[PDB]
Amino acid sequence: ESADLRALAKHLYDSYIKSFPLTKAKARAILTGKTTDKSPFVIYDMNSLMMEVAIRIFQGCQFRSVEAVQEITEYAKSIPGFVNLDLNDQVTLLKYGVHEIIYTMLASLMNKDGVLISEGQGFMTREFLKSLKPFGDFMEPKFEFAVKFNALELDDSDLAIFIAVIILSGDRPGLLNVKPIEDIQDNLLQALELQLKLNHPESSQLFAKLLQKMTDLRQIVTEHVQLLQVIKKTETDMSLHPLLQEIY
Amino acid sequence: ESADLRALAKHLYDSYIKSFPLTKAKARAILTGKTTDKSPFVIYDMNSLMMGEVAIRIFQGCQFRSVEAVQEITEYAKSIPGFVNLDLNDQVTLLKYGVHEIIYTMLASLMNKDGVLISEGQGFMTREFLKSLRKPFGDFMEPKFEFAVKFNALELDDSDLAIFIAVIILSGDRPGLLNVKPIEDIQDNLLQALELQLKLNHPESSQLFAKLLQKMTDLRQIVTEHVQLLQVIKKTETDMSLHPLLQEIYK
Numbered sequence: 116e117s118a119d120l121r122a123l124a125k126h127l128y129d130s131y132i133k134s135f136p137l138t139k140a141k142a143r144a145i146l147t148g149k150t151t152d153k154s155p156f157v158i159y160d161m162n163s164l165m166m167e168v169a170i171r172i173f174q175g176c177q178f179r180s181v182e183a184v185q186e187i188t189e190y191a192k193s194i195p196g197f198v199n200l201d202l203n204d205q206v207t208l209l210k211y212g213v214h215e216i217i218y219t220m221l222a223s224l225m226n227k228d229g230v231l232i233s234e235g236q237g238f239m240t241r242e243f244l245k246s247l248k249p250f251g252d253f254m255e256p257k258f259e260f261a262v263k264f265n266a267l268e269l270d271d272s273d274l275a276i277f278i279a280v281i282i283l284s285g286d287r288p289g290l291l292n293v294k295p296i297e298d299i300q301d302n303l304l305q306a307l308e309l310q311l312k313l314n315h316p317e318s319s320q321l322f323a324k325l326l327q328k329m330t331d332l333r334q335i336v337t338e339h340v341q342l343l344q345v346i347k348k349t350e351t352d353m354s355l356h357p358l359l360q361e362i363y
Numbered sequence: 364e365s366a367d368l369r370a371l372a373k374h375l376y377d378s379y380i381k382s383f384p385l386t387k388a389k390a391r392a393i394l395t396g397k398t399t400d401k402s403p404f405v406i407y408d409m410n411s412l413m414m415g416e417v418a419i420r421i422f423q424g425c426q427f428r429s430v431e432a433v434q435e436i437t438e439y440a441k442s443i444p445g446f447v448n449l450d451l452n453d454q455v456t457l458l459k460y461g462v463h464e465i466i467y468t469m470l471a472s473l474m475n476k477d478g479v480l481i482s483e484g485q486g487f488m489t490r491e492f493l494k495s496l497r498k499p500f501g502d503f504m505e506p507k508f509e510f511a512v513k514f515n516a517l518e519l520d521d522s523d524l525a526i527f528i529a530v531i532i533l534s535g536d537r538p539g540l541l542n543v544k545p546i547e548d549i550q551d552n553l554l555q556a557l558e559l560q561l562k563l564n565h566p567e568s569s570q571l572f573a574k575l576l577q578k579m580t581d582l583r584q585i586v587t588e589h590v591q592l593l594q595v596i597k598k599t600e601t602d603m604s605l606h607p608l609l610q611e612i613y614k
């Protein structure tokens with residue numbers, strides 16, 4: 116019945132707002148969408164950056180991503196049925212879902228020329244990121260995904276349901292009880308479909324186009340982790356950085 | 364109008380039957396009990412194999428089947444409304460990237476958890492036998508079995524698959540495409556047709572449409588794993604020849 120579907124959509128939206136500080140609505144108003152109170156500092160080269168380069172940028176991204184995981188974790192616990200799953204299955208779903216979610220939400224903060232950083236008080240150009248060492252290949256395939264993903268023109272109410280769909284996948288390795296997970300994901304998928312039909316009545320087969328983006332998304336995540344291995348292949352030793360690499 | 368969508372579904376199923384010699388219907392009519400004029404000979408070891416012809420030989424037999432499959436898929440693609448009216452370069456790109464995803468979708472029709480039909484359904488080669496092949500070749504088919512067992516649980520029939528295969532071809536997020544708009548226009552039509560087909564054919568199956576579209580994620584990874592395997596085989600088997608058509612498809 117369409118009432119608990121809209122109820123679910125509204126519920127996810129509100130939770131998404133509470134959990135994630137920088138919404139797409141706010142990000143877009145800051146990006147090339149302009150407004151008149153505060154423009155972000157723009158990092159376009161080595162001197163404008165000047166707060167250490169290459170390694171320290173990568174490390175800055177890890178700090179932020181560790182923050183993101185905790186925001187996503189809180190959001191997951193608001194998905195009806197999630198906290199009632201097997202504890203091991205909750206951990207597994209977050210462990211394998213969090214990267215997909217991070218690059219999905221990161222698109223909200225990107226345009227074809229750069230990405231918002233530091234709660235949007237900053238902007239790092241796409242071109243500055245390409246000019247880096249082994250690290251100049253990290254962000255670029257994310258930019259290419261974002262350009263295509265953002266073409267769908269989803270807003271936060273759409274993204275909230277989509278993010279829940281990703282978390283409740285069901286094909287994650289090592290799950291103990293797949294049934295209640297795919298039951299929840301069936302319900303979320305229904306809510307997303309209705310949401311897209313109501314929010315974007317003249318965008319045909321948007322639901323289908325969005326799900327097809329998961330194919331790009333998972334290969335991006337796969338490529339990314341393999342890239343992460345190559346960096347554990349040159350800077351390695353002297354951990355006067357003790358528990359902080361333990362945090363990571 | 365649903366009527367134009369039904370007519371498109373019927374057109375595609377028709378071309379599917381005309382293009383592909385071994386349908387899911389027939390493959391499921393050799394595998395299960397059913398008919399006993401179409402019982403396959405079963406290959407499960409070397410002696411039962413030599414009721415035939417190993418490793419490298421199986422692999423090149425597989426190569427030739429793939430090449431055939433490219434011809435069948437190409438003939439099918441041309442029947443898809445608007446496909447042949449596209450920029451010739453984009454026709455080539457769509458097939459380049461579409462062909463293996465379709466092969467592994469169709470391959471699932473020929474599979475159960477225990478093995479796979481071969482030689483147009485006259486033979487059946489065991490999963491365990493395939494997994495026991497020397498080193499590199501033993502990991503070739505196993506992830507295709509993994510996919511098939513899960514894909515086959517959707518219980519699609521040939522009229523479902525016909526439209527799904529067309530949807531795969533007309534992607535538009537394919538690398539290198541020149542004009543994405545007319546491709547995406549065709550795919551939207553195909554997606555509407557698929558959506559209708561699945562709700563009329565599987566009325567009690569909730570969100571089958573979304574669940575099927577998600578399988579596209581598994582297909583992509585199978586192809587990606589498969590390319591990595593071939594890179595390995597080409598380095599260890601310097602005396603083994605890969606077909607030029609297959610080489611052109613890979614990069």
Ligand SMILES: CCCCCCOc1ccc(C(=O)N[C@H](C(=O)NO)C(C)C)cc1
Pocket residue numbers: 383422425426427428429432433435436465466469470609
């Ligand atoms: C639509 C026609 C589908 C016919 C199904 C044939 O079954 C298969 C399954 C897997 C393969 C396969 O992976 N071939 C590899 C391949 O295509 N590498 O590119 C190698 C061995 C040639 C080929 C045929």
